[PDB]
Structure formats: C-alpha cells, structure tokens
Amino acid sequence: WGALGHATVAYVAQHYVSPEAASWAQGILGSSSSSYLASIASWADEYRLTSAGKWSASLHFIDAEDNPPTNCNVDYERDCGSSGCSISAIANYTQRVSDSSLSSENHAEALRFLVHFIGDMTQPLHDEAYAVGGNKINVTFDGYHDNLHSDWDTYMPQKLIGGHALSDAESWAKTLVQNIESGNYTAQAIGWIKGDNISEPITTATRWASDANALVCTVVMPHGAAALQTGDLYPTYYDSVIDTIELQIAKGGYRLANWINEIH
Numbered sequence: 001w002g003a004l005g006h007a008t009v010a011y012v013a014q015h016y017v018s019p020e021a022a023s024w025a026q027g028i029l030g031s032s033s034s035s036y037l038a039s040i041a042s043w044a045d046e047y048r049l050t051s052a053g054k055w056s057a058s059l060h061f062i063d064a065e066d067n068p069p070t071n072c073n074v075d076y077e078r079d080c081g082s083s084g085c086s087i088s089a090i091a092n093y094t095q096r097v098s099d100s101s102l103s104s105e106n107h108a109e110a111l112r113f114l115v116h117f118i119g120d121m122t123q124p125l126h127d128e129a130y131a132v133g134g135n136k137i138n139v140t141f142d143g144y145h146d147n148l149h150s151d152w153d154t155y156m157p158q159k160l161i162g163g164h165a166l167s168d169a170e171s172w173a174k175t176l177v178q179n180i181e182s183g184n185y186t187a188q189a190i191g192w193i194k195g196d197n198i199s200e201p202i203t204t205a206t207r208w209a210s211d212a213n214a215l216v217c218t219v220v221m222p223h224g225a226a227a228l229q230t231g232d233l234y235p236t237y238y239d240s241v242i243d244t245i246e247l248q249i250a251k252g253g254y255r256l257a258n259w260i261n262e263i264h
C-alpha cells in the first residue's frame, strides 16, 4: 500500500490496542499523539529511499513462485530468498522490540517496521512474484497509464477515498472500525487473527501471506494479465476489486492491534 493505506491500517490498529499496550508503544515511539502509529506508518518506505536503507527493500514483500491464476501458493523456504522477505522481517523485529539488551531506538525502529510490514503483507501483489509483483503489468486506469501494482497500492484506494492526507486515512479508518465492531465485518473479524501467536512468528506470518496470495488467483488477475491490458480498468475491474481492498486494509489493522497487545 501507498500512504493512505498505511495510515489507515495504523488508525484501525490504534482503536483496538489495549490502553496499557498503547502507553508502552507511545513510550517506545516517544510520541503521545493521536496519530502516534499513523504518523510513522510510511517511515520504512522513506528509509529504503536512502543509501543507509537500500538493503531493506526486499523486506516489503515475498515473491511467491507460483502459477497464477491456475495455482496460487506460498512456501516460506522456496520463496523468501537470500536477502530476506516480509515473513523473516516479522520474525526479526517481533523479537527485537522486546529484547532487553537492545537500545531504545533499536526498539523504536523495530516497532516502526512492524507497523509497516503487517500492512504491506495484506496487499496481494506483495505476496506474488509474477511480473515483478505486478509492476510490469502496464494498464489504463481512469485515463492514466499506470501499472497493476501502483493501482492496488495507491490509485484505486485514492479513487475510493479522495486524498491521502492523515485526515483522509482517519475517516476511512472510522468506517472500517464501525464495520468491525457493529457491521459487515463483525462476524469475520475473529477469523483474521485466529491462531496468531507471537511465539510462532514464521507460521503466523506465512498464514497472513497465504491469505493474501490466494486473492491473486481469484480477484487480482482471475483471467490472466492480457485481460487487464486492454480497456480502461475503471469502472468494471475497479468495481470487482474495491471490496477486497477495504477488506485487506481492515485485516491489516486488526492484526497489527492484536500483535501489539500480545507483545505487551
């Protein structure tokens, strides 16, 4: 996800963290603001744009080597790779935030990374190798020449909401929260975190990856890529996927809240 998506996942998480957990994260982040998690949700993307951070680019995704749309599957040892992936990064930093030998700012870095990666994992193209996670699939959306990946990360979410300011993410999170507590997602919500255990970060994260990867075959490119490079994707393709985007942003937020609560 782009900026709006990351901030939204964070605001949703802020709603579900216990009051005690919310004070430990605020202490660790050195900020007691109303946007304590949301304001740093995109830090990892800014970091990879620096020479110091270039090494971390591969942590934002897992290139599942499957065969969409026929067969979608994730395999940790087959797909993670030599330079790490989102799954190994979840394990690394879950352990580092609560390590007593590390420094305060080592803890702040780990938390900032967790806030980000738990969200990135729900974007289906972040769990798929094909065409470089869809970046090579050139398409037309709303009259513009984008690529599949950027449409899922940024353009479709912004088409729905209308902007990427923190205030936009705050309002989107509000509707999502309503739906989880008293709406369409209420019955589903518990299944999003069922089984998640901080003492089993690899098994847990692989589960999150498989859940998102399955959508590549059924929703992202159910009829191959050639079917997507031929007309404008709005409104027909847009209409068929926008419900899934909201669902994935909500899962990220709910899972992040529960992860922080368990760690605390």
Ligand SMILES: *[C@@H]1O[C@H](CO)[C@@H](O[C@@H]2O[C@H](CO)[C@@H](O)[C@H](O)[C@H]2NC(C)=O)[C@H](O)[C@H]1NC(C)=O
Pocket: 055, 084, 088, 089, 092, 093, 109
């Ligand atoms: C676990 O997290 C640490 C902290 O971010 C990673 O350490 C960085 O590793 C890169 C590449 O080796 C170095 O260039 C950085 O300078 C390191 N930073 C620090 C603060 O140590 C570490 O590589 C991560 N390990 C895994 C397996 O992902």
Ligand SMILES: *[C@@H]1O[C@H](CO)[C@@H](O)[C@H](O)[C@H]1NC(C)=O
Pocket: 138, 139, 140, 229, 230
């Ligand atoms: C995709 O890439 C090539 C190069 O731009 C182009 O010839 C083809 O028509 C493209 N598809 C669209 C939708 O541009």
Ligand SMILES: *[C@@H]1O[C@H](CO)[C@@H](O)[C@H](O)[C@H]1NC(C)=O
Pocket: 197, 199, 200
């Ligand atoms: C988490 O993992 C350990 C097993 O290693 C277990 O004792 C604990 O009950 C597990 N389940 C939850 C929900 O924490």
Ligand SMILES: [Zn+2]
Pocket: 001, 002, 006, 119, 120, 153
């Ligand atoms: Zn992202």
Ligand SMILES: [Zn+2]
Pocket: 001, 002, 123, 126, 149, 153
């Ligand atoms: Zn992306």
Ligand SMILES: [Zn+2]
Pocket: 001, 044, 045, 060, 116, 120
């Ligand atoms: Zn990212």
Ligand SMILES: [Zn+2]
Pocket: 015, 181
């Ligand atoms: Zn509530």
